[PDB]
């Protein structure tokens, strides 16, 4: 699709076998999902936003589907106020910002 | 142009007559610029991101140029880590997210 930006560019994702809504975020380097149970090994990380930092669980090689695109990438899980799809996955689905 | 997302989507902006670099951010509702001297009336506001909220100066009806595209909009100024161009201005220059 070509997504206009009058509202938040939200898409449906599947992660850990669960359907969720997430924000396509060109300003985010990484993909960060709200606190959930996810199976697998992980390692701690801290990531920085506009209001400071949060601690997350970094999961490598996680299967995730984004607006029907089947992907495999690193997914961070932590106390983000919104599910965020960042550049690591925007690149996998071939997204571009056009003007 | 059409900007891929292998790298941060950084562009040159002009604000207050001064050239700066900024991030085109579809995940940002608003536009927030690092602390700078900008003429004009303003009022305080809070904006929230990962990590919490920050207090900024809200300037209404500010002229700004984004990668050669002029626009007039609300611009926030405060202790943001990076200059961010949000949806309020992305929509004004006709930007879309495509995949
Ligand atoms: C990987 C991670 C997600 C942590 N990235 C960010 O938070 C980066 C941080 N940098 C900075 C950075 C910090 C440290 C290291 N490298 C980079 C600045 C830009 N953000 C990207 C933003 O797009 C993220 C969104 C998330 C969000 C959306 C809706 C509601 C809550 C949170 C964001 O912060 N948006 C907020 C926002 C932003 C600007 C203006 C107004 C508003 C309101 C709101 O839309
Ligand atoms: Cl859960």
Taking the centre of ligand 2 as the mean of its atom positions, its distance from the CA of residue A50, in whole angstroms, is 26
The chain B residue lying nearest A52, using CA atoms, is B51
Contact A97 B95 (CB under 8 A): yes
Whole-number Å distance between alpha carbons of B37 and A93: 40
Spatial neighbors of A42 by CB under 8 A, at least 6 apart, are A57, A58, A59, A77
Backbone phi and psi for residue A32, each to the nearest 5 degrees, phi listed first: -130, 125
Report the run of H or E that residue A96 belongs to, with start and end: strand A96-98
CA dihedral of A74, A76, A80, A83, whole degrees rounded to 10: 40
Residue B91: which of A6, A24, A90 has the nearest Cβ? A6
For domain B1-99, say whether CATH 2.40.70.10 is its number: yes
Whole-number Å distance between alpha carbons of A68 and A82: 20
HSE-CB of B69 using CA atoms within 13 angstroms: 16
Cβ atoms of B76 and B58 within 8 Å: the answer is yes
What technique solved it? X-ray
User: What is the structure's resolution, reported in angstroms to one decimal?
Assistant: 1.5
Pocket of ligand 1 (CB under 6 A): A 23, 25, 27-30, 32, 47-50, 81-82, 84, 86; B 25, 27-30, 32, 47-50, 81-82, 84, 86
Structural domain boundaries of chain B? 1-99
Question: Which H, E and C letters describe chain B, residue by residue?
Answer: CEECCCCCCEEEEEECCEEEEEEECCCCCCCEEECCCCCCCCEEEEEEECCEEEEEEEEEEEEEEECCEEEEEEEEEECCCCCEECHHHHCCCCCEEEC
Which residue bears the tokens 């909009």?
Answer: B73
**Which residues sit opposite B40 in a β-bridge?**
none
């Amino acid at each position: 699709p070509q997504i206009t930006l009058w509202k938040r560019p939200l898409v449906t994702i599947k992660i850990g076998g669960q359907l969720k809504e997430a924000l396509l975020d060109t300003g985010a380097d990484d993909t960060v999902i709200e606190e959930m149970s996810l199976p697998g090994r992980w390692k701690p990380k801290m990531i920085g936003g506009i209001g400071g930092f949060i601690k997350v669980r970094q999961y490598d090689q996680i299967i995730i589907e984004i607006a029907g695109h089947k992907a495999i990438s690193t997914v961070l899980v932590g106390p983000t106020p919104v599910n965020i799809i960042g550049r690591n996955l925007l690149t996998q689905i071939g997204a571009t910002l056009n003007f």
